[PDB]
Design a binder for this molecule. Structure first.
Ligand SMILES: CCCCCCCCCCCCCCCCCC(=O)OC[C@H](CO[C@@H]1O[C@H](CO[C@H]2O[C@H](CO)[C@H](O)[C@H](O)[C@H]2O)[C@H](O)[C@H](O)[C@H]1O)OC(=O)CCCCCCCCCCCCCCCCC
Ligand SMILES: CCCCCCCCCCCCCCCCCC(=O)OC[C@H](CO[C@@H]1O[C@H](CO[C@H]2O[C@H](CO)[C@H](O)[C@H](O)[C@H]2O)[C@H](O)[C@H](O)[C@H]1O)OC(=O)CCCCCCCCCCCCCCCCC
Ligand code: CLA
Ligand code: CLA
Ligand code: CLA
Ligand code: CLA
Ligand code: CLA
Ligand SMILES: CC1=C(/C=C/C(C)=C/C=C/C(C)=C/C=C/C=C(C)/C=C/C=C(C)/C=C/C2=C(C)CCCC2(C)C)C(C)(C)CCC1
Ligand SMILES: CC1=C(/C=C/C(C)=C/C=C/C(C)=C/C=C/C=C(C)/C=C/C=C(C)/C=C/C2=C(C)CCCC2(C)C)C(C)(C)CCC1
Ligand SMILES: CC1=C(/C=C/C(C)=C/C=C/C(C)=C/C=C/C=C(C)/C=C/C=C(C)/C=C/C2=C(C)CCCC2(C)C)C(C)(C)CCC1
Ligand SMILES: CCCCCCCCCCCCO[C@@H]1O[C@H](CO)[C@@H](O[C@H]2O[C@H](CO)[C@@H](O)[C@H](O)[C@H]2O)[C@H](O)[C@H]1O
Ligand SMILES: CCCCCCCS[C@@H]1O[C@H](CO)[C@@H](O)[C@H](O)[C@H]1O
Ligand SMILES: [Ca+2]
Ligand SMILES: [Cl-]
Ligand SMILES: [Cl-]
Ligand SMILES: [Fe+2]
Lengths: 451, 334, 137, 38, 342, 81
C-alpha cells in the first residue's frame, strides 16, 4: 500500500498516476494493462464492424475504418476492391480480442499483485530514469521491435499475397510488389520535398513500390539505430541539451505523437494510394474534380464543345489553365488541380487534360466512378446527414476520411498541449521551482530594475 | 568569455527591457516582416483576385476603403495551397494581383506567434516561475492557426482563409455559417460558453475583489492608492468576499481557496477557446454542425418546420449569394 | 392529415388501373430508396443531372411513360434516356447492371415495387417540395 | 528574383542556426536556481 | 419598538442555507416562474399557431430546437395576460397564443430586479461594497434592451428573440441579414468587451497560478493556501517583471487590475445594449454611403462590404417567407437572388 | 454551517431511501401517464401528429386577429374534421 494517498506521494488523486513515476513494477502494470485496452478495442471494433457489414455496400457508406485498413493490406478483397472473403477480417478481430486478455492479465498482475518496484527484483528489467545508459538500451530494444514491424509490412507486400493497389491496370487489384524502390534519392527525396500544394511532402507518395521500399529503409534504420543505442550512451552535447527525467521523456514522446497525428490527418485527407478511395471514399479534392468531370461528360453528350465554352467570368466553363499552363478543370475546383487518381489519369496528356481524349476516350466506368465519388463527397453533419450543411435529411453518410482526419486533429492538438504542459513542468521540476517561488530566495528581487 | 558565450548571455539576459531569448531570435524578424508588409499592404495594395476568377477585390485604403471595410485580401483561388513567395512571381505586379502579401503576412505571423508562445515559456524559466502561462496562450494561438492555416488546408485553398480585415472577418463568418452550420456545432457552442463564461467570471472576480477592498484611503483619493506595489499583505478580504458570494448563492458554490479560484478563472475560457478552435479545425474537414432539416414530420408525412429549418433558410440565402460568379456546377463541394 | 389508403393508391399501369399500397410497403419503399437511390435522388431531384427530376409530371412525359408502377419497375430493370432512345444501364443502377452497381444485387421484384410506390406517393404528400430542390427546403 | 531568393534563404538559415545552436549551448543550466542539469 | 415588521425582518434575514431577505419575496417566485414557464413550454407547448413551428419535446424537437416562441405578430405588444381580452382566462388558448412568452419575459424581468436587489441586500448585511450589483447592471441592460425595448420599437413581440437555442441562432442570423449588425460600432464595442473580458479572465488566472509562492511541500499547490492568511499567495513583483518583459507593459496595482476586470466586460455589454436600442427603430449601421455611390457608378469596384451586402440580401429573400408567415410573402423562384449555378 | 442537516448525512440514511424509493418512481410514472394518456396534448393545446393539418390542406393555421384569436383557433380546430 505504498504511495497511494496525497500525504505520502505529494500528488492529489486527480494527478494520481504521477504517483507511479518511481514505482517501475506498478508502472509496467499500468502500461501493459493500457496496451491491453488498445488491442481490445482493435479486436472488438473489428468484430463490431464485421457484424454490421454488408458486402454489396461500399465500405465508406457503412461507417467502417478498421476493415478498410485490413482490406488495404490485401486481405478479403479482389479486383476493384470488391469483398471476396470476410473471414480474414474475422480472424484479425478475434486474434486481437483474445490477445487483449493476455495483455490485461499481465497488466493487472504487475499492477496490483507483482513487485511494486523492479530494481531489487531484476537489474535487467529494473531502471532508473536518470540512468542514461539504461534508458538508451530500452529505447534500443523498442527501435529494434519497430524495425521488425516495418519489415513485417514489407514481408506482407513481397511474400504474402501483396497489397491492394488502387493504381493497378484495369481498376484496383491486390498485387505482389516484386521490385520495391530502393534508390535512396527517391526515398529521402520524399523527405526533402515541400509540404505545399502540388508537392505535398511525404503525403504525396503515389505508388506501392515507393511505400514498400520506404518501409525497407525504415526497418533497417530502426534496427541499426536500436543496436546503436543499446551499444552506446548519450554524448556530452546530447547530455547538456536535454532534461533527463520520466516526465521529460514523456514530454518528448508527447511532441512526437502530436507531430505524427497532424501528419496522419493530412495523409488520410489527401492520399488515395495507401488510403484507397474504393475503401475510404473519395478525397475532397477528388470529389470536387469528379463533379467537374461529371458535368463535362453530361454537357458534352448534349453537344457542347467543352474546350471552347467560355464561362461567365471569362475563364473556361469546363477547362482552363493552371498558373503554370496545364489544362485543368474549371469552376472552384481550379484549386484542386494537383489531384491525381486512377479514374482521371487516362484523360491526362503532357499538357494536362487532353481535349481529344476527352472527346473520344471517356469510358462508361469513368463516368460511373465520377458520379459515385461526386455524390460521396466528404461533407456531412455531426449526426451523419450526408452533404452540404443546407441539405435535408435522407442520406445517412459521413466519410471515413472526415471521421479519421477530425479525430486525429483533435488528438494531435491535445497531445501538443500535453507536450507543452509536461515539458515546461519537467524543466521547472528539474531546476527545482515547480511548486512555486521560494520567498527567501525570489530571483526577481536579486535582479536590477528594468527602469 | 568568448564571443558566442557573450552573445548567448545577452540573448538570454533577464536584464533586457524586453526579453529576447532564443524563441525571440525567430520571433523578432518574423513579426517585423509580417507587420511591415501588413501596414504597407493595408494602405497601398492594389485589388486582389481572391477567388481566381479575375474579379479583383479592393482591400486597401488608397483604393477606396475605410478602416471598417479595408483588408489584406487572401491569395488567389488559382493558387490553392501552392507556395507563392515573391520570387515565384514574374513581377511584383503579378504577386500583388494574385494576393502574395497575404501569404507572406500569415506565414510570418504564425511562425512569430508560435515563437511568442515559446518565449512565454522561456522567460518563465529564466525567472524561476512556473511554466504554464504559454499553455493559456495556446488557445488564442490555436484559433489563429485554425482560421489562417488549418481551414485553408482542409478546403484546399488559402483563398478560403480568413481575410486580414474587419468586414473580411464578417464575410468569413457568414460563409462559414452557410457551409458548415457552425452555430449548430457543439464546439462553437462550448466556445461561446468559454467566452461568455470568461466575461462573466472576469466581471465577477473583479467586482468581488473590488467590493472587498480593505479601507486604506479617504474618499477624496482613489482607492487604488491603498495598494502599494510589492507589499506583502493582501489588499482585500477574501473571507468577506466569500461570505457575501456564499450568501448570494449558497456557501458551497463559492470559492474560499484563492488558488482554486484563479485556476478556475484560467481554465474556463482556455478550455472553451480550445473547443472553439477545434471546431473550426474539424469543420475544416467538413464534419459540420447538427442537421435537423426536416427532422419533424407529421402523421401523413408533411414537414413540420422547427427553428432549425428557419436557420436553414437563412443559411441558404448565404449559400446562393456567396461568391456569386465562382460556381459553374450545382454543388459547392469546397 | 394521415397516411390514408387514398394517398397510397397509385397508377399501376398506363391503362389507368390502380394499386393500393400498404403503409408497410410505402415505408419499405422509403428505406430502400434511401439505400439505393437517395445519394443521387434525395428529395426527388437528380444530383448528377438536375435537368431530370422524379416529379410525376416529368415521369408522365418520359418515353415510355414512367408515372406508374410498371413504368418505374421496368425503368429499374432497364433504364433508358428520357426519349426512350438509349439504354443507360451502363451508367445508371439497374438489375441489368447489378454487376457494376452491387447494391442492386439484393433487390427483389417486391423491392422494385416498393421503391416505385414510394416515388409515386411522395409527391402526393410533399407537393412542390418533391423534386423542387433547395428553393422549397 | 533569384538574388532575393538566395538572400532570404541565407537569412532564414542564419536565424535558424542561431536558434538551434543557442538551445544547444547549455540551456537547461540557464535558470536562476539549480544549474547542474546534465 | 419590536413590532411585526421588525420580527418579519428578523425572520427574513436568518442565516440559513439559502438566504431569503426582503428581496427574496420578489426574486424567488419570479425566477421560479420564469424558469418554470420555460421548462413547461419547451416540454409541452407548440408554436404552430404563432409561427407555424413545432417547438416542444412533445412534438419531437430536441434540446437544441425547442423554444418558447414569441406570440403571433397580430398580438402586437399585448401584455397577453391570462385573464386578458385575448386569452380570456382560457389557459390552453393562452398557451396557443404565445402567452408563456410574455409570462417568462415579464417574470424574468422582475426576477432580475429581485436578484440585483438581493445583491444590494446581502452586501449591506455583510458590510461589503456593492460592486457586484453594479456589475450586474450590464446583464440587466442587455436583457431589457434585447427582450423588451427592441420588440417595443418593432411591430410586435413576434420579433423579440424566442427562448430556445436554435431560435436564438435564428435571431443572430436575422440581425446580420436585416440589420447588418456586425457592422455596428456599438456591437463591435460589445465584442471587444466580451473577448477582452475572457482574455483578462484567462491571463489573470494563469498569471496567478504561475507566480505562486511555494507555501507547501506537495506537488499539488492548491493545499498551500489559507483563507485567513495575511500574505499574498503569488508574487506580484515577479508577475510584473514577467509581463513587462514579455509584452512591454504590465499591471503594478492589484486594485486597478481587479477594477479593470470589472470595467471591461460590463462596459462592453452596456455599449452593445445601446446599439440594440437603435435597432429597435431600424436605426442601423447598414451602409457606407461613399461605398454605395462608388459601386453604383463603377461596376468594377468591390470590397468585403459590398460582398457582405450580397449575403444579407440572400438571407432576407430566402428566410423572409418562412420566418414571417403573417406577411404572406410569395416570392416566385424567378425573383430569388442567386449567384451562378447555386 | 447554518443548522440544517448535512446532505451527505441525509442521502445515505436508510429512511431517506425508504421514502424516496417510493416517491421518486411514483413521480416518474405520473409524468409518463400524463403524456401516455394524451392529457398533455389537451392541456397545452399541442397538436397530435395527425392534427397539424387537414388531410388535403397545406396552409398553416396562423392567428391573424388580436381580439378574435381564440375564436380563430377554435375554428381551425373545427376544420380538422
Ligand atoms: C519540430 C518543429 C518542426 C517545425 C518545422 C517548420 C517547417 C514548416 C512546418 C510545416 C508547414 C506546413 C504548411 C503547409 C501545410 C499543408 O498544406 O499540408 C498539406 C500537406 C499535404 O499536401 C498535399 O499533398 C497532396 C499530395 O497528394 C497527391 O498524391 C496522392 C497520392 O495518393 C493523390 O494522388 C493526390 O490526389 C495527389 O494530389 C498534393 O500535393 C496537394 O497539392 C498538397 O496540398 O500536408 C503535409 O505535407 C504534412 C502535414 C503538415 C503539417 C500540417 C499540420 C499543421 C500543424 C498545426 C498545429 C496547430 C498548432 C496550434 C498550437 C497552439
Ligand atoms: C431600466 C430597467 C428597469 C427594469 C425593467 C422593468 C420592466 C417593467 C415591465 C415592462 C412593462 C412595459 C409594457 C410595455 C407595453 C407597451 O409599450 O405596449 C405598446 C403600447 C402601444 O400599442 C401599440 O401601438 C401601436 C401604434 O398604434 C396606434 O397607431 C395605429 C396605426 O395608426 C392605430 O391608429 C392604433 O389605433 C394606434 O393605437 C400599434 O397599435 C401596436 O400594434 C401596439 O402594440 O404602448 C403602451 O401600452 C404604453 C406606451 C406608453 C408608455 C411607454 C413606456 C414603456 C416603453 C419604454 C420604452 C419605449 C421605447 C420605444 C422604442 C425605443
Ligand atoms: C488506462 C488507465 C489506467 C491504468 C492502467 C491505471 C493504473 C494504475 N493506477 Mg491510475 N488512474 C486512472 C487511470 C489508470 N490507472 C484514472 C482515469 C484516474 C483518475 C481517477 C487514476 C487515478 C489514480 C490514483 C489516485 C491512483 C492510481 C493508481 C494506479 C496504480 C495502482 C492502482 C491500484 O492499486 O488500485 C487497486 C484497485 C483495485 C484492487 C480494484 C480493481 C482494480 C483492477 C485492476 C480492475 C480489474 C478489472 C478487470 C476487468 C480485470 C480483468 C482480469 C482478466 C484479464 C482476467 C495502477 C498502475 C494508484 C497508484 O499510483 O499507486 C501507487 C493511485 O494511488 N490511479
Ligand atoms: C511490457 C512487457 C512486459 C515486460 C517488460 C515484463 C517484465 C517482467 N515480467 Mg511480466 N507479464 C507481461 C508483460 C511484461 N512483463 C504479460 C503480457 C504477462 C501475461 C502473460 C505477464 C505476466 C507475468 C507473470 C505471471 C510474471 C511476470 C514477471 C515479469 C518479470 C520477470 C519476467 C522474466 O524474467 O521472463 C523471462 C523472459 C521470458 C520468459 C520471455 C517471454 C517470451 C514470450 C512469452 C514469448 C512472446 C514474446 C513476444 C515479444 C510476443 C510479442 C508481444 C507483442 C505482440 C505484444 C519482468 C519484470 C514475473 C515477476 O514479476 O516476478 C515477481 C512473474 O512472475 N510477468
Ligand atoms: C525512437 C526514436 C529515437 C530517439 C528518441 C533517439 C534519441 C537520441 N538519439 Mg538516436 N537514432 C535513432 C532513433 C532515436 N534516437 C535511429 C533510428 C538511428 C539510426 C538512424 C539513430 C542514430 C543516432 C546517432 C548517430 C546519434 C543518435 C543520438 C540520440 C540522442 C541525441 C538526440 C538529439 O539530440 O536529436 C536532436 C535532433 C537533431 C540534432 C536534428 C537536427 C536538427 C534539425 C534542424 C531538426 C529539424 C528536423 C525537422 C523538424 C524534421 C522534419 C523532417 C525532416 C527530415 C526534413 C538521443 C538520446 C546521438 C547520441 O548521443 O547517441 C549516443 C547520436 O550521436 N541517434
Ligand atoms: C480514432 C478514433 C475513432 C474514429 C475516427 C471513429 C469513427 C467512427 N466510429 Mg468509432 N469508436 C471509437 C473511436 C473512433 N471512431 C472508440 C474509442 C469506440 C469505443 C466507444 C468506438 C465505438 C463505436 C461504435 C459502437 C460505433 C462507432 C461508429 C463510428 C462511425 C460513426 C461515428 C459517429 O457517429 O460518432 C458520433 C460523434 C460523436 C459521439 C462525437 C463525440 C465527441 C467527443 C465526446 C468529444 C471528446 C473530445 C476529447 C476527446 C475530450 C477532450 C477533453 C479535454 C478537457 C482535454 C465513425 C466512422 C458507429 C458506426 O457506424 O459503426 C460502424 C458506431 O455504431 N464507433
Ligand atoms: C501518453 C499520454 C500521457 C501520459 C502517460 C500522461 C501522464 C500524466 N499526466 Mg499528462 N497530459 C497528456 C498526456 C499524458 N499524460 C495530454 C495529451 C494532456 C493535454 C490535455 C495532458 C495534460 C495534463 C495535465 C494538465 C496534467 C497532467 C498530469 C499527468 C500525470 C498525472 C495523470 C493523472 O493521474 O490523471 C488522472 C486522470 C484523470 C483525472 C481523468 C481525466 C478525464 C478526462 C478529462 C476525460 C476525457 C473525456 C474522454 C476523452 C471522452 C468522454 C468519455 C466519457 C463521456 C465517459 C501523469 C504523469 C498531471 C501532472 O502534472 O502530473 C505531474 C496534470 O496536472 N497531464
Ligand atoms: C490497472 C488499473 C486499472 C486498469 C485496468 C485495466 C486497463 C485492465 C485491462 C484489462 C483488459 C484489457 C482485459 C481484457 C480482457 C479480455 C477478455 C476477457 C476477452 C475475452 C474474449 C472472448 C471471451 C471472446 C469471445 C468470442 C469469440 C472467441 C468468438 C467471437 C465472439 C466472442 C466475442 C463471443 C484501472 C483503470 C481500473 C484503475 C485501477 C488500476
Ligand atoms: C516509410 C515510408 C517512406 C520513408 C520514410 C522515411 C525514410 C522517413 C524518415 C524520416 C526521418 C529521418 C525523420 C526525422 C525526423 C527528425 C526530427 C523530427 C528531429 C527533431 C529535432 C528536434 C525536436 C530537436 C530539438 C532541439 C533543438 C531544435 C535545439 C536543441 C535542443 C533540442 C534537441 C530539444 C516514404 C515516404 C519513402 C514512403 C512512405 C513509406
Ligand atoms: C408555467 C406556469 C406555471 C408554472 C409551472 C412550473 C413552476 C413548472 C416547473 C417545472 C419544472 C421545475 C420542470 C423541471 C424540469 C427539469 C428537467 C426536464 C431536467 C432535465 C435534466 C436533464 C436532461 C439533465 C441533463 C444533464 C445536464 C443538463 C448536465 C449534466 C449531465 C446531464 C445529462 C444529467 C404556473 C402553474 C405557475 C402558472 C401557469 C404557467
Ligand atoms: C541544421 C541543424 C544542425 C544541428 C547540428 C547538431 C550537432 C550536435 C553537436 C553540436 C556540438 C555541440 O555544440 C554545443 O554548443 C556550443 C558551441 O560552442 C557549446 O559551447 C557552449 O558551452 C556551454 C554549454 O554548457 C554554454 O554555456 C556556452 O554558452 C557555450 O559556449 C556547447 O557545449 C555544445 O554542447
Ligand atoms: C410597510 C411598512 C408599514 C409599517 S406599519 C407600522 O408597523 C409597526 C410595527 O412594525 C406598528 O407599531 C405601527 O403602528 C405601524 O404603523
Ligand atoms: Ca545504452
Ligand atoms: Cl464550380
Ligand atoms: Cl462572398
Ligand atoms: Fe485575482
Amino acid at each position: 500500500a505504498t504511495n497511494r494517498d496525497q500525504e505520502s506521494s505529494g500528488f492529489a488523486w486527480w494527478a494520481g498516476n504521477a504517483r507511479l513515476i518511481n514505482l517501475s513494477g506498478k508502472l509496467l502494470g499500468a502500461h501493459v494493462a493500457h496496451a491491453g485496452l488498445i488491442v481490445f478495442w482493435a479486436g472488438a471494433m473489428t468484430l463490431f464492424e464485421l457484424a454490421h457489414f454488408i458486402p454489396e455496400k461500399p465500405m465508406y457508406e457503412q461507417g467502417l475504418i478498421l476493415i478498410p485498413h485490413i482490406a488495404t493490406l490485401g486481405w478479403g478483397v479482389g479486383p476493384g476492391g470488391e469483398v471476396v472473403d470476410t473471414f480474414p477480417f474475422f480472424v484479425v478481430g478475434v486474434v486481437h480480442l483474445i490477445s487483449s486478455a493476455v495483455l490485461g492479465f499481465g497488466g493487472v498482475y504487475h499492477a496490483i499483485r507483482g513487485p511494486e518496484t523492479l530494481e531489487e527484483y531484476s537489474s535487467f528489467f529494473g531502471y532508473d530514469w536518470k540512468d542514461k545508459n539504461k534508458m538508451t538500451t530500452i529505447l534500443g530494444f523498442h527501435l529494434i521491435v519497430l524495425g521488425i514491424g516495418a519489415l513485417l509490412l514489407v514481408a506482407k507486400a513481397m511474400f504474402f499475397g501483396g497489397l491492394y493497389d488502387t493504381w493497378a491496370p484495369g481498376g484496383g487489384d491486390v498485387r505482389v510488389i516484386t521490385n520495391p524502390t530502393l534508390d535512396p534519392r527517391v526515398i529521402f527525396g520524399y523527405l526533402l520535398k515541400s509540404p505545399f500544394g502540388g508537392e505535398g511532402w511525404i503525403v504525396s507518395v503515389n505508388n506501392l513500390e515507393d511505400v514498400v521500399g520506404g518501409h525497407i529503409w525504415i526497418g533497417l534504420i530502426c534496427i541499426a539505430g536500436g543496436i546503436w543505442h543499446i551499444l552506446t550512451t548519450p554524448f556530452g552535447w546530447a547530455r547538456r541539451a536535454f532534461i533527463w527525467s520520466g516526465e521529460a521523456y514523456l514530454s518528448y514522446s508527447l511532441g512526437a505523437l502530436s507531430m505524427m497525428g497532424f501528419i496522419a490527418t493530412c495523409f488520410v485527407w489527401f492520399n488515395n494510394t495507401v488510403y484507397p478511395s474504393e475503401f475510404y471514399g473519395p478525397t475532397g479534392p477528388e470529389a470536387s474534380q469528379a463533379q467537374a468531370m461529371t458535368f463535362l461528360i453530361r454537357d458534352q453528350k448534349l453537344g457542347a464543345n467543352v474546350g471552347s465554352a467560355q464561362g461567365p467570368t471569362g475563364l473556361g466553363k469546363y477547362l482552363m489553365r493552371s498558373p503554370t499552363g496545364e489544362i485543368i478543370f474549371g469552376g472552384e475546383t481550379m484549386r484542386f488541380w494537383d489531384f491525381r487518381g486512377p479514374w482521371l489519369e487516362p484523360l491526362r496528356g503532357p499538357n494536362g487534360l487532353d481535349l481529344n481524349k476527352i472527346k473520344n476516350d471517356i469510358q462508361p466506368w469513368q463516368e460511373r466512378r465520377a458520379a459515385e465519388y461526386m455524390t460521396h463527397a466528404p461533407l456531412g453533419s455531426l449526426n451523419s446527414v450526408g452533404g452540404v450543411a443546407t441539405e435535408i435529411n435522407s442520406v445517412n453518410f459521413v466519410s471515413p476520411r472526415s471521421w479519421l482526419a477530425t479525430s486525429h486533429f483533435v488528438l494531435a492538438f491535445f497531445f501538443l498541449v500535453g507536450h507543452l504542459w509536461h515539458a515546461g513542468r519537467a524543466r521547472a521540476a528539474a531546476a527545482g521551482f515547480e511548486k512555486g517561488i521560494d520567498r527567501e530566495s525570489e530571483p526577481v528581487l536579486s535582479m536590477p530594475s528594468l527602469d | 568569455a568568448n564571443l558566442w558565450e557573450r552573445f548567448c548571455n545577452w540573448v538570454t539576459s533577464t536584464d533586457n527591457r524586453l526579453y529576447v531569448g532564443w524563441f525571440g531570435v525567430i520571433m523578432i524578424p518574423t513579426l517585423l516582416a509580417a507587420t511591415i508588409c501588413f501596414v504597407i499592404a493595408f494602405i497601398a495594395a492594389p485589388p486582389v483576385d481572391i477567388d481566381g476568377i479575375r474579379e479583383p477585390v479592393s482591400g486597401s485604403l488608397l483604393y477606396g476603403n475605410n478602416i471598417i471595410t479595408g483588408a489584406v485580401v487572401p491569395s488567389s483561388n488559382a493558387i490553392g495551397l501552392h507556395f507563392y513567395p515573391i520570387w515565384e512571381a514574374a513581377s511584383l505586379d503579378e504577386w500583388l494581383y494574385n494576393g502574395g502579401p497575404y501569404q507572406l503576412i500569415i506565414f510570418h505571423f504564425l511562425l512569430g506567434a508560435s515563437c511568442y508562445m515559446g518565449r512565454q515559456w522561456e522567460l518563465s524559466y529564466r525567472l524561476g516561475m512556473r511554466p504554464w502561462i504559454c499553455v493559456a496562450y495556446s488557445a488564442p494561438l490555436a484559433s489563429a492557426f485554425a482560421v489562417f492555416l488549418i481551414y485553408p488546408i482542409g478546403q484546399g485553398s488559402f483563398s478560403d482563409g480568413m481575410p486580414l480585415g474587419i468586414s473580411g472577418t464578417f464575410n468569413f463568418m457568414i460563409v462559414f455559417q452557410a457551409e458548415h452550420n457552425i452555430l449548430m456545432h457543439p464546439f462553437h457552442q462550448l466556445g461561446v460558453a468559454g467566452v461568455f463564461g470568461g466575461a462573466l467570471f472576469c466581471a465577477m472576480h473583479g467586482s468581488l475583489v473590488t467590493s472587498s477592498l480593505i479601507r486604506e484611503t479617504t474618499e477624496t483619493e482613489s482607492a487604488n492608492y491603498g495598494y502599494k506595489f510589492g507589499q506583502e499583505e493582501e489588499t482585500y478580504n477574501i473571507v468577506a468576499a466569500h461570505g457575501y458570494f456564499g450568501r448570494l448563492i449558497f456557501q458551497y458554490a463559492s470559492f474560499n481557496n484563492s488558488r482554486s479560484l484563479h485556476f478556475f478563472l484560467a481554465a474556463w475560457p482556455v478550455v472553451g477557446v480550445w473547443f472553439a478552435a477545434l471546431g473550426i479545425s474539424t469543420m475544416a474537414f467538413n464534419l459540420n454542425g447538427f442537421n435537423f432539416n426536416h427532422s419533424v414530420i407529421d402523421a401523413k408525412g408533411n414537414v413540420i418546420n422547427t427553428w432549425a429549418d428557419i436557420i436553414n433558410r437563412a443559411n441558404l440565402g448565404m449559400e446562393v449569394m456567396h461568391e456569386r460568379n465562382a460556381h459553374n456546377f450545382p454543388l459547392d463541394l469546397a | 392529415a394521415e397516411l390514408t389508403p387514398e394517398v397510397l393508391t397509385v397508377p399501376l399501369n398506363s391503362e389507368g388501373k390502380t394499386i393500393t399500397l400498404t403503409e408497410k410497403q410505402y415505408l419499405e419503399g422509403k428505406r430502400l430508396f434511401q439505400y439505393a437511390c437517395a445519394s443521387c435522388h434525395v428529395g426527388g431531384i437528380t444530383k448528377t443531372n438536375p435537368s431530370l427530376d422524379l416529379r410525376t409530371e416529368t415521369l408522365a412525359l418520359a418515353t415510355p411513360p414512367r408515372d406508374n408502377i410498371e413504368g418505374l419497375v421496368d425503368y429499374m430493370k432497364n433504364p433508358t434516356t428520357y426519349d426512350g432512345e438509349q439504354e443507360i444501364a451502363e451508367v445508371h443502377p439497374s438489375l441489368r447492371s447489378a454487376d457494376i452497381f452491387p447494391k442492386m444485387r439484393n433487390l427483389t421484384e417486391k423491392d422494385l415495387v416498393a421503391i416505385a410506390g414510394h416515388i409515386l406517393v411522395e409527391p402526393k404528400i410533399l407537393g412542390d417540395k418533391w423534386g423542387g430542390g433547395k428553393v422549397y427546403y | 528574383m533569384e538574388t532575393l531568393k538566395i538572400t532570404v534563404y541565407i537569412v532564414v538559415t542564419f536565424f535558424v542556426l542561431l536558434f538551434v545552436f543557442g538551445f544547444l549551448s547549455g540551456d537547461p543550466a540557464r535558470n536562476p536556481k539549480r544549474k547542474d542539469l546534465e | 419598538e419590536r413590532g411585526w415588521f421588525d420580527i418579519l425582518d428578523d425572520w427574513l434575514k436568518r442565516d440559513r442555507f439559502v438566504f431569503v431577505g426582503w428581496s427574496g419575496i420578489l426574486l424567488f417566485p419570479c425566477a421560479y416562474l420564469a424558469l418554470g414557464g420555460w421548462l413547461t413550454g419547451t416540454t409541452f407547448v407548440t408554436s404552430w399557431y404563432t409561427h407555424g413551428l413545432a417547438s416542444s419535446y412533445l412534438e419531437g424537437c430536441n434540446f437544441l430546437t425547442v423554444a418558447v416562441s414569441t406570440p403571433a405578430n397580430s398580438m402586437g405588444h399585448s401584455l397577453l395576460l391570462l385573464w386578458g381580452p385575448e386569452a380570456q382566462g382560457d389557459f390552453t388558448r393562452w398557451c396557443q397564443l404565445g402567452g408563456l412568452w410574455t409570462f417568462i419575459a415579464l417574470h424574468g424581468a422582475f426576477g432580475l430586479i429581485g436578484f440585483m436587489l438581493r445583491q444590494f441586500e446581502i452586501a449591506r448585511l455583510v458590510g461589503v461594497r456593492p460592486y457586484n450589483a453594479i456589475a450586474f447592471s450590464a446583464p440587466i441592460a442587455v436583457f431589457v434592451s434585447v427582450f423588451l425595448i427592441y420588440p417595443l420599437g418593432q411591430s410586435s413581440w413576434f420579433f423579440a428573440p424566442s427562448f430556445g437555442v436554435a431560435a436564438i441562432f435564428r435571431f443572430l442570423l436575422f440581425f446580420q441579414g436585416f440589420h447588418n449588425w456586425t457592422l455596428n460600432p456599438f456591437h463591435m464595442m460589445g465584442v471587444a468587451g466580451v473577448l477582452g473580458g475572457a482574455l483578462l479572465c484567462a491571463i489573470h488566472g494563469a498569471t496567478v497560478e504561475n507566480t505562486l509562492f511555494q507555501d507547501g511541500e506537495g506537488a499539488s499547490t492548491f493545499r498551500a493556501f489559507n483563507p485567513t492568511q495575511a500574505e499574498e499567495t503569488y508574487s506580484m513583483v515577479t508577475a510584473n517583471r514577467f509581463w513587462s518583459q514579455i509584452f512591454g507593459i504590465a499591471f503594478s496595482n492589484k486594485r486597478w487590475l481587479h477594477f479593470f476586470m470589472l470595467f471591461v466586460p460590463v462596459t462592453g455589454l452596456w455599449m452593445s445594449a445601446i446599439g440594440v436600442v437603435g435597432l429597435a427603430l431600424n436605426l442601423r449601421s447598414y451602409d457606407f454611403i461613399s461605398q454605395e455611390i462608388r459601386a453604383a457608378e463603377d461596376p468594377e469596384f468591390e470590397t468585403f462590404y459590398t460582398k457582405n451586402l450580397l449575403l444579407n440580401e440572400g438571407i432576407r429573400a430566402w428566410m423572409a417567407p418562412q420566418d414571417q408567415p403573417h406577411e404572406n410573402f410569395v416570392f416566385p423562384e424567378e425573383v430569388l437572388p442567386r449567384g451562378n449555378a447555386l | 454551517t447554518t443548522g440544517e442537516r448535512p446532505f451527505s448525512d441525509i442521502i445515505t440514511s436508510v429512511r431517506y431511501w425508504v421514502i424516496h424509493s417510493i416517491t421518486i418512481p411514483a413521480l416518474f410514472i405520473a409524468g409518463w401517464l400524463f403524456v401516455s394518456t394524451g392529457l398533455a396534448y389537451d392541456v397545452f393545446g399541442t397538436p397530435r401528429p395527425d392534427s397539424y393539418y387537414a388531410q388535403e390542406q397545406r396552409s398553416i393555421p396562423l392567428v391573424t386577429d388580436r381580439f378574435e384569436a381564440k375564436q380563430q383557433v377554435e375554428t381551425f380546430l373545427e376544420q380538422l374534421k
